């Protein structure tokens, strides 16, 4: 998320065995990184 010129990153990792879908359950994401970058953002893309 991008707020007041800060780009904030949260994340978590979990073991799974369900290939098909997101698992039905709960676990929260911790803050990892916070970038004071000031960019106006409207679009994004992902690296393979």
């Amino acid at each position: 998320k991008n707020i007041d010129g800060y780009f904030k990153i949260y994340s978590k990792h979990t073991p799974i065995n369900l290939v098909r879908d997101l698992p039905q359950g709960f676990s929260a994401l911790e803050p990892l990184v916070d970038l004071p970058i000031g960019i106006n953002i409207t679009r994004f893309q992902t690296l393979l």
Binding site: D4, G5, G38, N40
Partner: peptide
């Protein structure tokens, strides 16, 4: 502070046009 003793010449190298947003 005033920088008339540093940045004046006049000097045209300084230019102008929001909350921590640049205007490139």
């Amino acid at each position: 502070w005033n920088s008339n003793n540093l940045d004046s010449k006049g000097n045209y190298n300084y230019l102008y046009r929001k909350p921590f947003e640049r205007d490139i």
